[PDB]
Amino acid sequence: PDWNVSTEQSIQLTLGPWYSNDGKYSNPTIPVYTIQKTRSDTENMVVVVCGEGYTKSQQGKFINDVKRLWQDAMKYEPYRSYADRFNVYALCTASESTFDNGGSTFFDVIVDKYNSPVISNNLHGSQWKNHIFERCIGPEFIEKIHDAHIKKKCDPNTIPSGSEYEPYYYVHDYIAQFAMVVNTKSDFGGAYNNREYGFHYFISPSDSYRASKTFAHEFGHGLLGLGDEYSNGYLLDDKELKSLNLSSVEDPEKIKWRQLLGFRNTYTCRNAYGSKMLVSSYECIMRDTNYQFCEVCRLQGFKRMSQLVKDVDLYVATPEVKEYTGAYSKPSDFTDLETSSYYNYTYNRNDRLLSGNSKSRFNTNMNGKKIELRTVIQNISDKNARQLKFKMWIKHSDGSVATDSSGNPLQTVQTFDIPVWNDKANFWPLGALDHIKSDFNSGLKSCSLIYQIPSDAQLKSGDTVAFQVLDENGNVLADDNTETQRYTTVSIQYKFEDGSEIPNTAGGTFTVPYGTKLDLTPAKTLYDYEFIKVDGLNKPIVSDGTVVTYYYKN
Ligand SMILES: [Zn+2]
């Protein structure tokens, strides 16, 4: 057949018998499409997506499939908070046969007896097939396309058996993640993280009934470093320190995530009846693909991604307001690790919740009652300690601050000190091959502000709890409208100054909070084109389908 995509930007590989023993892909041409390039590759996390089982005439489907899956992944926190700090490239790897036809494919993917997708070295006797990403595709991409333009060092068809891993370690520092999308409807998924031996890729299907959730799940194993919360077993020591989101420590005073206990749906429990593997929440995507990321996974994932960029200095989880009753306020309240205790906890939280979609639960019977504003804040600086001010007040329906019988406003303020992240260098820094141990509480502070509503509070129907989390300059980092905020879709398009579209680009779509002013320094180049101007930055995004246009010369 013929390519149904532009060939103007491409890379060429040389695959000898170790990577293509049958010769079917000895000298393949791989067209390169830019799904998103908001900044220089040196400042963003670079994601490279290749297609398995797409013929030359199916590359239009492959690009659209990558855009769909990537956009749906960017709707999950913590990815969403970094959506504009990814650069995404689609590499149109052509297979002779479609996957469903079962002939020759670019990556020799088979589905084993465990429904796992695996690059099969022994399918055609290509003994280094599953090293293709870090030894062939990666170095060619980093030399020709990546703004760093690192010249290839070692010949991938010549390197002798012995120290064949170290010369390719740099690949996974310039390319944050390799993703392989299989043109199929079968439901499978698998991540392969073993950087000491060069593996950092995952495989997911394009059209399964849960393709988008599977993509976000395997991306969390690969990029975020999260473990499966469905796994059995028993984390002994060393394994306890290694795991970001799993634990086997049963004393709530010693659990790594003690500071998060009682915050939203964080209640330690076993991942199954009679299991010694504990999770911080029974509703997380890393256990069941129908859920969102739990608070620990969001914290850990956010921290991991902060290592790969240089301009993120603080994590502020979405605060919550609850009636303070003393329930679930001390570590002893969390000693029961059964799933019954978790769901009883979530029911207690819902009964006391006064924020988000439960902001309406506030009523005039709240007089003389205590309310608690709570969130979790992670400092990203290993250098600068932070001080954040929490303000909370009772607000009437019309926006006025409620008062007591003396006319004193029902408001309270408390400043919290966020310590530095001293242990930062131990938490998947750029260049690490693995994670061994980290201090979960380094740079971490649970902040709780308890306010006693006076008994003489002049409450009216429709009153609500308002709050603000402010930084040292007074910027609002989160408020009582954050949880239910509307998000608007924004697209980045790439055009020449005359107005035509730049070939081999296909701008994707991500969401930002309504009213967001995008503040990004565009990359100086796009392929060999030089950046001129951008239309759409530094203005409030107030409509779905807003287009920001990057303009390039020639
Ligand atoms: Zn989780």
Which string of DSSP letters, residue by residue, matches 372-409?
A: EEEEEEEE--SS--EEEEEEEEEE-TTSPBPB-TTS-B
The answer to whether 255 and 241 are in contact (CB under 8 A) is no
Residues 333 and 277 in one domain: yes
Write down which residue in 191, 222, 253 finishes a domain: 222
Whichever domain contains 19, its CATH number is: 3.40.390
Write down which residue in 172, 187, 222 finishes a domain: 222
Residues 542 and 503 in one domain: yes
With 0-12 / 13-18 / 19 or more C-beta atoms within 10 angstroms meaning exposed / middle / buried, residue 441 is middle
Distance CA(279)–CA(68), nearest Å, equals 30
Residue type, 226: L
Count Cα atoms within 13 angstroms, Cβ side, for 265.
17
Query: Ligand 1 mean position to 269 CA, how many Å?
Result: 12
Query: Ligand 1 mean position to 325 CA, how many Å?
Result: 27
Residue with the two structure tokens 């206990």: 261
Residue with the two structure tokens 């915050």: 263
Residues 327 and 286 in one domain: yes
* Token representation of residue 159: 């390197």
420: nearest Cα among 461, 466, 385, 373: 385
Q: Give resolution, Å, one decimal.
A: 2.0
* Residue 396, annotated as binding a ligand: no
Residues 85 and 178 in one domain: yes
* Residue 92, annotated as binding a ligand: no
Residues 149 and 28 in one domain: yes
Kindly give the interhelix angle for 59-73 and 211-222, rounded to the nearest 10 degrees: 70
Long-range (24+ apart) CB contacts under 8 A made by 347-353 are: 349/264, 349/265, 349/322, 352/322, 352/323, 352/325, 352/327, 353/320, 353/321, 353/322
Beta strands, E only, 212-254: 246-247
517: nearest Cα among 540, 536, 534: 540
| The total number of structural domains that make up the chain | 3
In 3-state terms, what secondary structure has residue 195?
helix
51: nearest Cα among 235, 179, 210: 179
Distance CA(132)–CA(198), nearest Å, equals 10
The answer to whether 40 and 305 are in contact (CB under 8 A) is no
Q: Is residue 3 part of a domain?
A: no
Method: X-ray
223: nearest Cα among 196, 193, 246: 193
Q: How many CB atoms lie within 10 A of CB 189?
A: 22
* Residue 217, annotated as binding a ligand: yes
Find how far residue 448's CA is from the centre of its chain.
Answer: 26
* Token representation of residue 172: 């996974």
Distance CA(439)–CA(241), nearest Å, equals 8
Identify any residues that bridge with 376 across adjacent strands, giving them in sequence order: 446
* Residue 229, annotated as binding a ligand: yes
Residues 458 and 498 in one domain: no
In 3-state terms, what secondary structure has residue 164?
coil
Residue type, 540: P
Query: Ligand 1 mean position to 293 CA, how many Å?
Result: 5
Residue type, 10: S
Distance CA(491)–CA(480), nearest Å, equals 28
The answer to whether 405 and 470 are in contact (CB under 8 A) is no
Name the strand (E) or helix (H) holding 496.
strand 487-496
Identify any residues that bridge with 495 across adjacent strands, giving them in sequence order: 501, 551
Cα Dmax for the chain: 87
Q: Is residue 235 part of a domain?
A: no
Q: How many CB atoms lie within 10 A of CB 203?
A: 24
Distance CA(343)–CA(353), nearest Å, equals 15
Write down which residue in 479, 504, 530 finishes a domain: 479
Q: How many CB atoms lie within 10 A of CB 360?
A: 10
Name the H helices within 74-127.
none
Residues 208 and 99 in one domain: yes
Distance CA(225)–CA(222), nearest Å, equals 6
Strands 487-496, 546-552: pairing is parallel
Q: Is residue 28 part of a domain?
A: yes
Return left, alpha or beta for 445; rule: phi > 0 is left, psi -120 to 50 is alpha, else beta: beta
Distance CA(523)–CA(89), nearest Å, equals 15
Q: Is residue 180 part of a domain?
A: yes
Residues 112 and 171 in one domain: yes
Per-residue three-class SS string for 298-315: HHHHHHHHHCCCCCCCEE
Report the residue count for the chain: 554
Backbone phi, psi, residue 185, to 5°: -105, -10
392: nearest Cα among 461, 473, 330, 447: 447
Q: Is residue 70 part of a domain?
A: yes
Residues 361 and 400 in one domain: yes
Query: Ligand 1 mean position to 297 CA, how many Å?
Result: 4
In 3-state terms, what secondary structure has residue 89?
strand
Distance CA(540)–CA(513), nearest Å, equals 10
Distance CA(133)–CA(248), nearest Å, equals 35
Q: Is residue 231 part of a domain?
A: no
* 259-296: burial string, b at 16+ Cβ within 10 Å, e else: bbbbbbbbbbbbbbeebebbbbbbbbbbbebebbbbbb
Find how far residue 253's CA is from the centre of its chain.
Answer: 29
Query: Ligand 1 mean position to 167 CA, how many Å?
Result: 34
Whichever domain contains 527, its CATH number is: 3.10.20.320
Residues 295 and 433 in one domain: yes
Range of the domain at 23: 10-222
Distance CA(408)–CA(85), nearest Å, equals 45
The answer to whether 257 and 266 are in contact (CB under 8 A) is yes
Query: Ligand 1 mean position to 256 CA, how many Å?
Result: 14
* Token representation of residue 120: 């099969």
* Token representation of residue 489: 């879709």
DSSP one-letter code for 215: H
The DSSP annotation for 398-448 comes to TSPBPB-TTS-B-EEEEEEEE---GGGGGSS-TT-S------TTTTEEEEE
The answer to whether 19 and 132 are in contact (CB under 8 A) is yes
Residues 346 and 434 in one domain: yes
Query: Ligand 1 mean position to 317 CA, how many Å?
Result: 14
320: nearest Cα among 401, 399, 258, 263: 263
Residues 471 and 493 in one domain: no
Peptide bond into 78 cis (omega under 30): yes
Q: Is residue 1 part of a domain?
A: no
Residue type, 12: Q
Q: Is residue 229 part of a domain?
A: no
Query: Ligand 1 mean position to 124 CA, how many Å?
Result: 38
* Residue 228, annotated as binding a ligand: yes
Q: What CA–CA distances, in Å, run from 241 to 197, 255, 256, 420, 439?
A: 22, 11, 9, 20, 8
Query: Ligand 1 mean position to 270 CA, how many Å?
Result: 13
Using only C-alpha atoms, the chain has a radius of gyration, in whole angstroms, of 25
* Residue 447, annotated as binding a ligand: no
